[PDB]
Amino acid sequence: NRPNRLIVDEAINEDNSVVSLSQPKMDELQLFRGDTVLLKGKKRREAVCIVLSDDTCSDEKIRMNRVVRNNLRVRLGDVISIQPCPDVKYGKRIHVLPIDDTVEGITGNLFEVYLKPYFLEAYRPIRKGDIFLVRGGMRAVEFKVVETDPSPYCIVAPDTVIHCEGEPIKREDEEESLNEVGYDDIGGCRKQLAQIKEMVELPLRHPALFKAIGVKPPRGILLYGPPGTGKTLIARAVANETGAFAFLINGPEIMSKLAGESESNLRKAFEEAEKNAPAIIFIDELDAIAPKREKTHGEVERRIVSQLLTLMDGLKQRAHVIVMAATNRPNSIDPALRRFGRFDREVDIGIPDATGRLEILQIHTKNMKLADDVDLEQVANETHGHVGADLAALCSEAALQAIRKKMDLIDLEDETIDAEVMNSLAVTMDDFRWALSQSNPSALRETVVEVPQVTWEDIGGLEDVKRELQELVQYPVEHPDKFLKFGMTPSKGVLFYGPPGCGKTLLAKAIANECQANAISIKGPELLTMWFGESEANVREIFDKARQAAPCVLFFDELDSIAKARGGNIGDGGGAADRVINQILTEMDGMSTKKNVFIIGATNRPDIIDPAILRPGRLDQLIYIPLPDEKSRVAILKANLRKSPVAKDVDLEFLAKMTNGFSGADLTEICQRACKLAIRESIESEIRRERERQTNPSAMEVEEDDPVPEIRRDHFEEAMRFARRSVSDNDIRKYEMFAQTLQ
Amino acid sequence: NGPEIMSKLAGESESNLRKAFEEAEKNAPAIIFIDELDAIAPKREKTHGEVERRIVSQLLTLMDGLKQRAHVIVMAATNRPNSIDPALRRFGRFDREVDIGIPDATGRLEILQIHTKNMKLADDVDLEQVANET
Numbered sequence: 001n002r003p004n005r006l007i008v009d010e011a012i013n014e015d016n017s018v019v020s021l022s023q024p025k026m027d028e029l030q031l032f033r034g035d036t037v038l039l040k041g042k043k044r045r046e047a048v049c050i051v052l053s054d055d056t057c058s059d060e061k062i063r064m065n066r067v068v069r070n071n072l073r074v075r076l077g078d079v080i081s082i083q084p085c086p087d088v089k090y091g092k093r094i095h096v097l098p099i100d101d102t103v104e105g106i107t108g109n110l111f112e113v114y115l116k117p118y119f120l121e122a123y124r125p126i127r128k129g130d131i132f133l134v135r136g137g138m139r140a141v142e143f144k145v146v147e148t149d150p151s152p153y154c155i156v157a158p159d160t161v162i163h164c165e166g167e168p169i170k171r172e173d174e175e176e177s178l179n180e181v182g183y184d185d186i187g188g189c190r191k192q193l194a195q196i197k198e199m200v201e202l203p204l205r206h207p208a209l210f211k212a213i214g215v216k217p218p219r220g221i222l223l224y225g226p227p228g229t230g231k232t233l234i235a236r237a238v239a240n241e242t243g244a245f246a247f248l249i250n251g252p253e254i255m256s257k258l259a260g261e262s263e264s265n266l267r268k269a270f271e272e273a274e275k276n277a278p279a280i281i282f283i284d285e286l287d288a289i290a291p292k293r294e295k296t297h298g299e300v301e302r303r304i305v306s307q308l309l310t311l312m313d314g315l316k317q318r319a320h321v322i323v324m325a326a327t328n329r330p331n332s333i334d335p336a337l338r339r340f341g342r343f344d345r346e347v348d349i350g351i352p353d354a355t356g357r358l359e360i361l362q363i364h365t366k367n368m369k370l371a372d373d374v375d376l377e378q379v380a381n382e383t384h385g386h387v388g389a390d391l392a393a394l395c396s397e398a399a400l401q402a403i404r405k406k407m408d409l410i411d412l413e414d415e416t417i418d419a420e421v422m423n424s425l426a427v428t429m430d431d432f433r434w435a436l437s438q439s440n441p442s443a444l445r446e447t448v449v450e451v452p453q454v455t456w457e458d459i460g461g462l463e464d465v466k467r468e469l470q471e472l473v474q475y476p477v478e479h480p481d482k483f484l485k486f487g488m489t490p491s492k493g494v495l496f497y498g499p500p501g502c503g504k505t506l507l508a509k510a511i512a513n514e515c516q517a518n519a520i521s522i523k524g525p526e527l528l529t530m531w532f533g534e535s536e537a538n539v540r541e542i543f544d545k546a547r548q549a550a551p552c553v554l555f556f557d558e559l560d561s562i563a564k565a566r567g568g569n570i571g572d573g574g575g576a577a578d579r580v581i582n583q584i585l586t587e588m589d590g591m592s593t594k595k596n597v598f599i600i601g602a603t604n605r606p607d608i609i610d611p612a613i614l615r616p617g618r619l620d621q622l623i624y625i626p627l628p629d630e631k632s633r634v635a636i637l638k639a640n641l642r643k644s645p646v647a648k649d650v651d652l653e654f655l656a657k658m659t660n661g662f663s664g665a666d667l668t669e670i671c672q673r674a675c676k677l678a679i680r681e682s683i684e685s686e687i688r689r690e691r692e693r694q695t696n697p698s699a700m701e702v703e704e705d706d707p708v709p710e711i712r713r714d715h716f717e718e719a720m721r722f723a724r725r726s727v728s729d730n731d732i733r734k735y736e737m738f739a740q741t742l743q
Numbered sequence: 744n745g746p747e748i749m750s751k752l753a754g755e756s757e758s759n760l761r762k763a764f765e766e767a768e769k770n771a772p773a774i775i776f777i778d779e780l781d782a783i784a785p786k787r788e789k790t791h792g793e794v795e796r797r798i799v800s801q802l803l804t805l806m807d808g809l810k811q812r813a814h815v816i817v818m819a820a821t822n823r824p825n826s827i828d829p830a831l832r833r834f835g836r837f838d839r840e841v842d843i844g845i846p847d848a849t850g851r852l853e854i855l856q857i858h859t860k861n862m863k864l865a866d867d868v869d870l871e872q873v874a875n876e877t
Binding site: 228 | 791793796797800801803804807810812830833834838
């Protein structure tokens with residue numbers, strides 16, 4: 001609705017000093033011809049200069065020299081706030097000096113060769129930060145701000161004095177790029193970024209607006225996350241978006257200095273941050289300054305932790321200063337800092353999922369010059385365990401392997417052709433596959449949180465189980481009003497039991513998929529690790545994480561692992577009590593339903609699970625997953641072969657008909673054996689025909705007809721000739737007895 | 744040389760390590776070699792003192808101040824991977840590793856050849872059989 005809130009679009013006058021008009025808009029403005037109009041955009045950098053060299057284009061979209069997009073803006077679709085501010089002072093003059101592309105060739109004076117013919121009767125109505133193109137030649141070189149005799153911008157005049165003593169610097173441009181970093185650059189963490197924005201942007205942009213109510217803003221934020229996730233870029237991007245100041249503190253850099261000099265820098269940091277407008281301080285590798293004091297032994301260490309604490313306690317809320325710190329884990333710093341008034345809010349970065357890795361590949365892949373076969377999606381999905389720095393390494397590896405393996409006899413010779421052939425250079429899928437072959441992910445042991453994609457199209461039947469699940473997990477998160485009306489207490493668990501590998505792990509994920517909620521899976525080997533290692537404190541981390549990421553269906557399978565470890569039902573002299581079970585019970589009893597975190601269990605031998613966990617306030621529910629009946633195996637098969645070709649001579653319904661009861665993994669084994677037979681047959685036929693072509697000197701005999709680009713029935717009949725019923729009827733009867741009489 | 748750096752005084756230890764990188768930066772593409780890194784940056788659980796961490800911090804900060812525009816690369820020699828502070832095994836720091844290993848029968852033949860040049864051997868000397876039983 002703001003009248004001067006209008007889009008900006010393409011421009012044709014290669015001189016940036018021109019700014020457009022829109023006569024219907026000029027009638028709205030007081031836009032006068034002369035020196036300058038203040039056209040305001042983002043990050044406070046503007047493109048202020050002479051005006052009215054436009055009205056060639058349509059209205060509602062101001063024509064602004066494209067070079068004022070990289071500056072003052074980012075892309076199209078933006079909006080300008082054009083408001084005149086002509087008649088600026090006439091100081092001495094504005095800086096003259098190039099930046100990047102002038103040392104390449106004759107330099108002379110850098111003013112009187114190429115740039116002099118442009119400050120003619122248009123004597124630079126400018127604003128420091130306006131960047132453009134000006135030359136007396138190839139017509140592509142920048143003109144940047146270096147000096148400032150008058151603080152505000154002016155209109156130059158002759159007879160002045162200029163010093164091109166300055167040098168063009170290529171490296172400083174990289175520093176400018178760091179300033180340039182913005183939301184789109186950083187990727188792979190969207191939900192986490194939204195919280196940081198809603199936390200820090202609103203207090204910053206309008207301080208008095210948030211102060212009027214007077215509620216407390218945050219003082220400090222602590223970021224978790226393994227290395228390489230990208231945390232410096234987040235802080236720099238936030239600072240760039242809020243147009244505020246910044247200050248970086250490196251822990252190792254502070255530690256290196258002398259004992260006396262260590263405190264001076266840390267005091268100066270806060271002093272300088274306090275001397276400016278709303279600012280943000282960033283501390284990287286906090287563990288190097290304030291680690292768990294049981295490890296540290298000395299005098300300087302505590303004498304610096306105390307200084308950090310006292311400085312953190314002297315803000316007073318009237319300075320509009322916020323601080324963020326980077327640390328690997330929460331249990332790695334002195335708990336003194338994790339207190340109210342000190343660091344009190346935490347945000348976890350995590351590990352990018354399949355969606356985020358695609359964004360990271362996109363941001364990195366910009367000079368790749370890819371081919372049609374490059375399927376970035378397939379590349380991203382098969383990238384388990386990588387982080388924000390492994391992907392860059394993979395891209396570099398693929399690119400350099402292409403460079404070498406292709407120009408194995410070109411790049412070795414010195415000649416400009418190298419650059420030329422770099423234009424001819426491209427990249428193929430095989431390069432990415434090879435790079436993925438020699439890639440060691442830096443994070444494969446960490447707990448995984450994400451939304452599994454498995455849907456009930458992956459498992460056919462279990463209708464009543466579907467209904468019970470949707471009752472237990474779906475309905476509560478939609479209509480709490482019904483619980484309020486009838487005064488109801490949600491149930492917080494459910495237990496499974498039945499034969500082995502009948503899809504239990506394939507159901508929990510399913511409900512998560514229908515709930516769009518994350519999921520976490522834990523298996524018996526972990527439980528054994530905590531038993532033998534006698535470290536059950538880690539059980540508190542899992543729950544803690546489940547609390548940060550909610551909702552989650554925390555799944556425990558092979559619950560009977562520790563039970564069977566000390567024998568079966570008879571077991572040892574003891575009963576059915578252990579340590580990890582006690583910690584599980586404690587954490588369940590100390591959890592609130594109002595965070596919507598669900599817990600699921602699984603086991604094959606339910607008779608050897610402690611009954612101490614089936615009382616109210618706990619699972620208090622038992623569900624039995626049966627052997628698949630008719631046409632459930634049909635859906636299982638369709639899921640199995642949906643990634644492999646299949647002919648029509650084979651009918652999955654026939655395969656289902658032949659079997660009279662089987663487990664879940666056995667059908668997968670049958671399909672895999674059929675696939676193995678197909679692969680062996682194809683390879684053998686191909687090699688035999690290749691030998692026929694070799695021994696026979698038929699220099700030209702073209703024949704490309706794969707005898708088996710698919711699968712036939714023969715494979716499945718051969719598979720049927722060797723198959724096992726993985727479960728006996730005695731187990732079925734035992735489960736029947738376990739059903740007891742449920743009167 | 745790590746032991747050479749540790750021998751000097753506490754104050755003088757850092758000057759040499761700074762001068763090394765300064766000189767490496769003053770030349771064309773150069774390579775820095777550090778031998779027996781364990782003597783300067785061992786697992787901090789073993790080390791107890793002030794100079795040790797005050798030198799590890801200097802090493803880290805110097806390794807973090809290259810900027811990619813100097814064409815300087817560094818190689819370090821260490822017995823085992825789990826023998827140094829994990830701080831150095833991070834991105835931007837030492838990030839690539841190569842294992843030398845124990846030469847096999849083929850390699851020992853090459854070593855024998857490189858050493859055996861003034862031997863003045865006889866006919867019966869069958870270097871192959873010597874190499875295999877080594």
